[PDB]
Write a protein that holds these residues in place. Structure first.
Motif, mmCIF file in Angstrom:
data_model
loop_
_atom_site.group_PDB
_atom_site.id
_atom_site.type_symbol
_atom_site.label_atom_id
_atom_site.label_comp_id
_atom_site.label_asym_id
_atom_site.label_seq_id
_atom_site.Cartn_x
_atom_site.Cartn_y
_atom_site.Cartn_z
ATOM 1 N N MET A 123 -1.428 17.945 14.713
ATOM 2 C CA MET A 123 -2.522 18.376 13.854
ATOM 3 C C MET A 123 -2.541 19.885 13.645
ATOM 4 O O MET A 123 -3.179 20.354 12.698
ATOM 5 N N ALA A 124 -1.865 20.655 14.498
ATOM 6 C CA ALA A 124 -1.695 22.073 14.208
ATOM 7 C C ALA A 124 -0.541 22.316 13.250
ATOM 8 O O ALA A 124 -0.559 23.302 12.505
ATOM 9 N N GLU A 125 0.469 21.447 13.259
ATOM 10 C CA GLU A 125 1.573 21.599 12.318
ATOM 11 C C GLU A 125 1.147 21.222 10.903
ATOM 12 O O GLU A 125 1.294 22.017 9.968
ATOM 13 N N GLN A 126 0.610 20.015 10.723
ATOM 14 C CA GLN A 126 0.313 19.534 9.375
ATOM 15 C C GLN A 126 -1.124 19.836 8.955
ATOM 16 O O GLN A 126 -1.351 20.575 7.993
ATOM 17 N N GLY A 127 -2.099 19.276 9.663
ATOM 18 C CA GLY A 127 -3.486 19.652 9.455
ATOM 19 C C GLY A 127 -4.321 18.851 8.472
ATOM 20 O O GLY A 127 -5.231 18.127 8.888
ATOM 21 N N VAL A 128 -4.042 18.965 7.178
ATOM 22 C CA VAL A 128 -4.975 18.563 6.130
ATOM 23 C C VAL A 128 -4.588 17.229 5.500
ATOM 24 O O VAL A 128 -5.412 16.319 5.410
ATOM 25 N N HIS A 129 -3.337 17.096 5.050
ATOM 26 C CA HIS A 129 -2.918 15.900 4.318
ATOM 27 C C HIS A 129 -2.827 14.668 5.212
ATOM 28 O O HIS A 129 -2.850 13.531 4.707
ATOM 29 N N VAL A 130 -2.748 14.873 6.528
ATOM 30 C CA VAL A 130 -2.626 13.759 7.453
ATOM 31 C C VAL A 130 -3.902 12.935 7.506
ATOM 32 O O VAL A 130 -3.841 11.738 7.787
ATOM 33 N N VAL A 131 -5.064 13.525 7.211
ATOM 34 C CA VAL A 131 -6.276 12.712 7.247
ATOM 35 C C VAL A 131 -6.319 11.766 6.048
ATOM 36 O O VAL A 131 -6.765 10.620 6.179
ATOM 37 N N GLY A 132 -5.748 12.170 4.910
ATOM 38 C CA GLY A 132 -5.633 11.251 3.791
ATOM 39 C C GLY A 132 -4.600 10.173 4.045
ATOM 40 O O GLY A 132 -4.812 9.001 3.703
ATOM 41 N N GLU A 133 -3.485 10.544 4.689
ATOM 42 C CA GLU A 133 -2.460 9.549 5.003
ATOM 43 C C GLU A 133 -2.955 8.527 6.026
ATOM 44 O O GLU A 133 -2.736 7.322 5.858
ATOM 45 N N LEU A 134 -3.659 8.973 7.069
ATOM 46 C CA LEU A 134 -4.186 8.023 8.044
ATOM 47 C C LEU A 134 -5.378 7.241 7.501
ATOM 48 O O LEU A 134 -5.636 6.126 7.969
ATOM 49 N N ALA A 135 -6.097 7.776 6.508
ATOM 50 C CA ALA A 135 -7.117 6.971 5.844
ATOM 51 C C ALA A 135 -6.485 5.845 5.037
ATOM 52 O O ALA A 135 -6.987 4.714 5.039
ATOM 53 N N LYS A 136 -5.363 6.129 4.367
ATOM 54 C CA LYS A 136 -4.621 5.058 3.704
ATOM 55 C C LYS A 136 -4.041 4.069 4.710
ATOM 56 O O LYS A 136 -3.981 2.866 4.429
ATOM 57 N N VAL A 137 -3.650 4.555 5.894
ATOM 58 C CA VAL A 137 -3.124 3.680 6.946
ATOM 59 C C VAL A 137 -4.199 2.718 7.439
ATOM 60 O O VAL A 137 -3.971 1.506 7.535
ATOM 61 N N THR A 138 -5.392 3.236 7.746
ATOM 62 C CA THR A 138 -6.440 2.361 8.265
ATOM 63 C C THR A 138 -7.019 1.463 7.178
ATOM 64 O O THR A 138 -7.470 0.351 7.482
ATOM 65 N N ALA A 139 -6.954 1.879 5.907
ATOM 66 C CA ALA A 139 -7.329 0.970 4.829
ATOM 67 C C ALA A 139 -6.331 -0.174 4.704
ATOM 68 O O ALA A 139 -6.730 -1.339 4.573
ATOM 69 N N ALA A 140 -5.030 0.137 4.769
ATOM 70 C CA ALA A 140 -3.997 -0.889 4.708
ATOM 71 C C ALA A 140 -3.978 -1.775 5.943
ATOM 72 O O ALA A 140 -3.461 -2.894 5.878
ATOM 73 N N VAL A 141 -4.508 -1.299 7.067
ATOM 74 C CA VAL A 141 -4.677 -2.176 8.218
ATOM 75 C C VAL A 141 -5.863 -3.105 8.006
ATOM 76 O O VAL A 141 -5.738 -4.321 8.167
ATOM 77 N N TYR A 142 -7.019 -2.558 7.610
ATOM 78 C CA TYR A 142 -8.234 -3.371 7.585
ATOM 79 C C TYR A 142 -8.264 -4.386 6.448
ATOM 80 O O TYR A 142 -8.798 -5.488 6.641
ATOM 81 N N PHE A 182 0.795 -1.220 0.000
ATOM 82 C CA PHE A 182 0.000 0.000 0.000
ATOM 83 C C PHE A 182 0.830 1.273 0.000
ATOM 84 O O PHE A 182 0.356 2.301 -0.494
ATOM 85 N N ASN A 183 2.053 1.217 0.540
ATOM 86 C CA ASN A 183 2.951 2.339 0.814
ATOM 87 C C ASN A 183 2.267 3.452 1.604
ATOM 88 O O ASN A 183 1.983 4.516 1.039
ATOM 89 N N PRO A 184 1.978 3.263 2.892
ATOM 90 C CA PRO A 184 1.381 4.354 3.665
ATOM 91 C C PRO A 184 2.444 5.311 4.182
ATOM 92 O O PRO A 184 3.529 4.905 4.602
ATOM 93 N N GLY A 185 2.123 6.602 4.140
ATOM 94 C CA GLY A 185 3.041 7.624 4.591
ATOM 95 C C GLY A 185 4.069 8.072 3.576
ATOM 96 O O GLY A 185 4.787 9.045 3.838
ATOM 97 N N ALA A 186 4.175 7.400 2.434
ATOM 98 C CA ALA A 186 5.113 7.811 1.396
ATOM 99 C C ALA A 186 4.570 9.046 0.694
ATOM 100 O O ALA A 186 3.598 8.964 -0.062
ATOM 101 N N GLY A 187 5.192 10.194 0.946
ATOM 102 C CA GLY A 187 4.764 11.432 0.328
ATOM 103 C C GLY A 187 4.491 12.534 1.329
ATOM 104 O O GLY A 187 3.849 13.536 1.000
#
Ligand SMILES: CCCCCCCC/C=C\CCCCCCCC(=O)O[C@H](COC(=O)CCCCCCCCCCCCCCC)COP(=O)(O)OCCN
Ligand SMILES: CCCCCCCC/C=C\CCCCCCCC(=O)O[C@H](COC(=O)CCCCCCCCCCCCCCC)COP(=O)(O)OCCN
Ligand SMILES: CCCCCCCC/C=C\CCCCCCCC(=O)O[C@H](COC(=O)CCCCCCCCCCCCCCC)COP(=O)(O)OCCN
Ligand SMILES: CCCCCCCC/C=C\CCCCCCCC(=O)O[C@H](COC(=O)CCCCCCCCCCCCCCC)COP(=O)(O)OCCN
Ligand SMILES: CCCCCCCC/C=C\CCCCCCCC(=O)O[C@H](COC(=O)CCCCCCCCCCCCCCC)COP(=O)(O)OCCN
Ligand SMILES: CCCCCCCC/C=C\CCCCCCCC(=O)O[C@H](COC(=O)CCCCCCCCCCCCCCC)COP(=O)(O)OCCN
Ligand SMILES: N[C@H](C(=O)O)[C@H](OCc1cccc(NC(=O)c2ccc(C(F)(F)F)cc2)c1)C(=O)O
Ligand SMILES: N[C@H](C(=O)O)[C@H](OCc1cccc(NC(=O)c2ccc(C(F)(F)F)cc2)c1)C(=O)O
Ligand SMILES: N[C@H](C(=O)O)[C@H](OCc1cccc(NC(=O)c2ccc(C(F)(F)F)cc2)c1)C(=O)O
Lengths: 413, 413, 413
Positions: free
Chosen positions: B214-233, B104-109
């Motif tokens: 979440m104050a540092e990054q904010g927006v792209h982290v929700v897409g990265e953690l959505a890819k993380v939880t997809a690659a987990v499930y 899945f490559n989570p977090g790459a990018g």
């Protein structure tokens, strides 16, 4: 040998200091300094190595046993009020000593270099990064390195957990915590027995250190140590006046009528040089006021062991003398580290026979000035050479700091 | 204070996570990020320091006591077959999690850089040189540094020797080994009491970490953690399907008729989030099949503590997320080190109250990504922010992994 | 497996050496050396890692218990005279071995380089700076690093303090010191049990080391080890002749008439290769002279465990062979460190089952030549390959060194 051991150790090390200073001065004047540096200095380096050895197991084992021994319900409200008072007054004493060592600048103008190079200082982290470096990353890696403040926290946090374990309802965990506390208590008492042999060796290594340093420098050091003892005594009298007279007049006790009664046992501290050998004398002057028995029967034996104020001021002045003689510059952040270490060193090393040396060793370790660097040992030897008159004044304030403390508690109760 | 302590700690840390995420997002959107980074981040760095403190004495003391407690003749043949099954299935779970994290490559990018520079990776040794670095050169020097795998081996090899000593014929050596095992057990239970205070501090430091990240990054982290939880499930359902249906159909048990009976206590793991708080519920469904009492009275309390499969898969996916967000590249050799560490972490930290945090801390230490580096803590905070739904799925598989394990043993016996 | 364990371990490791040497020679001649270096050498590196693991807890725990066990009033005057004699003769044996290894130059002309580079030597401090580095700066930091001499001193100085604590008048401190000594005794016996498993693994790793080294070098090593065993045996006969005949003729005992009676149990040491398995045989020849029962009932079981002379000479010759094969140059200052370490290694590791390997490991650690460097392990394997005939001669002198020692004590008493 046996006639040398049976001599009392404090007069032994004092006559070693006095026989060291004059002999080092005449060997430095007659020109035999290089023979001293090549034949006598290893006997002092052996002593500072033996002093740096003992500081790490004591500050772990003694702190674990002492933190395991407390009980805030058994120790009464009088006890917790006097502990709050002792730690607050010791913190104010270190702060006032740092103030009176910045106001005088002792040791600035020596430019000490033993090997041929100056002391290279280490980069001090910012203020936030030290209070996060209080808690250790690795509790074994804090004991394997020096790291006095990352092992004080671990020792206290282990002792509190052993106290919570010892009164548990299960039996095997109570047996296990009891055997663990007994093993660490055995290590603490073994360290207390090794201290009583290193202190017997001390009147040879101290003589070697003074006969080396006073032969190397000679003349300007008496002016520098005169400025040191002036900066100790004016801050020491200012400590008594400001802190004790404000803390006595804020609670309504007349300080002149208090101290004119307290002088009869305050003056014997100036000639006894022992805050525990004047305890039956100051018990009389605690009885001479209107203090009830249940307060002064308990507080003054605690105040003679925990409450050290003049030693706390001298551990700020004689740790700015090292940094100002070595050319270093102590920033803020490692300046309150001296306060946080000198308070917890008094609360930690309570009842050790070598408290006066390891209580400065674990402050100079916590700043970043270890005693094995040959620039630190020379200025440490200058401090130990001047140490006698400072010990007189230190005991003079160290006894007064308890008689001004039980009266406040007897006033609120 | 007392009303805050008496709150249950898991709902406390969950509501700390939920109150942290939204508040960090609105502070990051409104532009007050630098004030957050200068005033709130030390409260999270204190928590990750308190989490890195506890991982070294636990993995020594708990492993010594646990290896000393075993007896292969007292533990029956059913016990050794289910231990072989649990360790084999946990190794396959870490391998399948590593596969579904490479696919899945989570977090790459992300290209995370907190201080202003990227994470510099360390040179990984070859494959042969790590299996020789399992055995420590110095057993004290493996505990003084991090070195999780050179101290697991030493703790196990000390516990087996204490077991061989305790049943010896001489009496003094039996007394000595008994006192040594009781001292190390006291250290283990003292660590278990310090864990129960650090976990009480956890709903402040966790809030600080999320409100920083979440104050540092904010927006792209929700897409990265959505890819993380997809690659987990998807790997989690593939874990259940492939591993459990092959290991059930190879022994003749119909998996559909098995799982349609097991669902009545499988579904409560999805809403309870606790593999030990559903133990009386899954005892009923173990009784509902034809399992004899002597197997399921013993195995399921062992399976709720040793057999962790979804946690083993999540400890591969959430340790590839750190290395792919930090720009590092995990080679083969430190890729099976994750397997060998995540299996032995489940077998080691069995019964600790802080297993879910130190079980990832001692894997990230074993790879070479320590949690005090400020690049690691941000991605670790992203994992802890997404951790709730992953904990739901993790408990869902962690309960099924025992009901598919006792049926195999009841089939062979 | 069980048939392999029940084999006696010394004949096991000897037949492992003999099966290793010839097989390594024919694999080195036929050209399959790179396959040996890539597939067999990790089995020897695992063994030298397992040998370097055990040297640090043994030299602490065994020394603490042994120093705690002594009592100079209970141990008689005969005991302290024979301890003075044993340590003096062992120091003279290491000095004579260093002399006969400087006179022969064994290993000079190999230019060993395994990885592709030579062994880079470390800067040796001067003579004064090592006797001050005997005492450790940090007693935990001496155990966390190697530092054999800064932990021998700390172990002895802890054992003497535990002895002074155990006979104290207070009860809690006696209980605490008793539990501490029992815990360290438990650690020592656990190390003695781990040694008895590493020695069971030894006939595989020793075979791997010899089959690697004799396949790498092959031909010139037999000339180098022939020079090694010549330099051992001529210094060994010179040891017997000079030291024992002077120390026998200075006290009036005719050495020819002494040794012609002692030969009947001296010759069985040459064919038994065990200084403890010939103890009932040498009890007869101690009875054959005019020695009273109260001397030879006590001294010869002490002389078979403490008094090791040929092992002390071989630990000088086989530690100059490593430094002369590695291209290093041992200066004076780390040349008497070999003497001070090989004496205290014999007095420390008394009764360990792995004395012959760790007694050289803790000398090569004290010089600065650790066994994990791949240049050191090859020459160490050459020494272990030649070790059998040297063990014959070593036992031959190790038995004679007690029969020449009880006669002196029986002459003065
Ligand atoms: C808090 C400090 C006051 C609690 C009592 C206390 O400090 O005990 C001291 C033991 O050391 C400690 O308390 C360290 C624990 C730090 C608590 C914060 C020594 O007092 P002592 O009466 O002289 O007994 C000597 C035996 N070691
Ligand atoms: C020279 C290197 C010096 C090394 C110092 C090592 C200290 C040894 C530690 C254990 C010795 C010890 O505890 O006993 C101590 C004796 O130590 C010594 O005398 C050895 C020092 C010799 C050189 C002194 C000049 C005294 O303890 P005590 O409580 O006063 O008991 C009195 C009689 N019962
Ligand atoms: C082999 C693993 C199976 C043997 C039993 C076992 O693993 O015990 C575990 C103790 O830890 C160990 O076994 C480590 C020893 C590794 C053996 C290889 C914990 O199991 P528990 O029933 O939850 O008891 C908790 C008390 N610490
Ligand atoms: C601020 C820096 C935080 C430091 C955390 C150090 C942890 C202290 C370790 C020992 C404290 C301990 O074990 O007690 C623990 C209490 O710890 C605390 O409350 C101190 C934490 C204060 C800040 C929490 C927000 C609870 O253990 P328990 O088994 O639930 O017992 C309940 C009543 N018997
Ligand atoms: C001084 C050395 C002579 C005192 C007696 C002695 O060395 O005991 C030895 C114990 O180790 C030590 O003595 C180290 C203490 C060094 C004292 C200087 C072993 O002798 P053993 O009779 O074979 O008993 C074996 C039990 N570990
Ligand atoms: C492969 C890596 C090798 C690792 C060596 C670790 C040594 C294990 C230490 C504890 C084992 C132990 O002490 O037992 C020892 C058994 O050790 C072994 O057999 C394991 C070695 C397997 C490979 C040997 C070829 C024997 O001790 P004992 O006093 O003779 O007792 C005989 C029966 N009661
Ligand atoms: N002045 C106070 C009070 O004597 O009671 C105060 O007591 C602390 C105290 C108590 C008991 C022993 C010690 N130790 C020493 O005096 C001492 C003095 C010199 C050395 C030296 F070896 F020279 F470094 C070592 C130790 C200190 C102090 O001396 O600072
Ligand atoms: N899902 C399983 C099961 O809950 O039973 C599995 O159990 C392991 C387990 C058991 C008991 C406590 C824990 N600890 C935690 O859940 C935990 C969660 C978060 C933190 C944090 F502080 F945020 F880092 C620390 C600890 C883990 C798991 O949570 O991974
Ligand atoms: N020769 C003496 C006497 O055999 O009694 C003397 O005894 C010391 C002694 C006593 C008991 C065991 C040992 N250990 C060994 O012989 C030994 C030999 C080889 C290894 C190896 F694994 F090859 F490194 C390990 C240990 C040594 C000696 O061997 O040096």
């Amino acid at each position: 040998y046996r006639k040398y051991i049976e001599y009392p150790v404090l007069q032994k090390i004092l006559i070693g200091l006095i026989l060291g200073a004059i002999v080092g001065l005449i060997l430095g004047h007659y020109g035999y300094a290089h023979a001293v540096h090549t034949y006598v200095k290893p006997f002092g380096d052996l002593f500072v190595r033996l002093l740096c050895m003992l500081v790490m197991p004591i500050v772990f084992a003694s702190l674990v046993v002492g933190a395991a021994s407390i009980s805030p319900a058994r120790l009464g409200r009088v006890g917790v009020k006097i502990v709050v008072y002792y730690l607050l007054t010791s913190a104010f004493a270190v702060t006032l000593g740092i103030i009176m060592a910045r106001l005088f600048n002792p040791g600035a103008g020596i430019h000490l270099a033993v090997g041929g190079q100056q002391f290279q200082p280490h980069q001090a982290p910012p203020l936030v990064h030290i209070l996060l470096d209080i808690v250790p990353t690795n509790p074994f890696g804090a004991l394997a390195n020096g790291q006095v403040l990352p092992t004080i926290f671990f020792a206290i946090i282990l002792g509190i957990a052993i106290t919570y374990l010892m009164n548990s309802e299960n039996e095997k965990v109570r047996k296990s915590a009891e055997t663990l506390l007994d093993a660490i208590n055995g290590l603490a008492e073994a360290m207390y027995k090794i201290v009583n042999g290193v202190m017997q060796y001390a009147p040879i290594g101290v003589f070697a250190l003074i006969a080396y340093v006073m032969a190397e420098q000679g003349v300007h050091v008496v002016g520098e140590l005169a400025k040191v003892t002036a900066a100790v005594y004016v801050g020491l009298t200012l400590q008594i006046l400001l802190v004790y007279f404000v803390l006595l007049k804020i609670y309504g006790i007349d300080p002149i009528s208090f101290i004119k009664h307290a002088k009869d046992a305050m003056l014997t501290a100036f000639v006894t040089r022992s805050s525990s050998g004047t305890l039956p004398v100051t018990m009389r002057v605690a009885k001479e006021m209107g203090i009830s028995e249940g307060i002064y029967s308990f507080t003054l034996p605690l105040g003679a062991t925990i409450n050290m104020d003049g030693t706390a001021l001298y551990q700020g002045v004689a740790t700015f003398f090292i940094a100002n003689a070595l050319g270093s510059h102590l920033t803020v952040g490692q300046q309150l580290t001296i306060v946080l270490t000198a308070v917890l060193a008094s609360i930690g090393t309570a009842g050790v026979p070598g408290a006066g040396a390891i209580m400065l060793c674990m402050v100079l370790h916590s700043v970043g000035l270890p005693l094995t660097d040959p620039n630190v040992a020379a200025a440490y030897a200058m401090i130990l050479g001047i140490d006698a008159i400072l010990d007189m004044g230190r005991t003079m304030v160290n006894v007064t700091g308890d008689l001004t403390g039980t009266a406040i508690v007897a006033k609120t109760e």
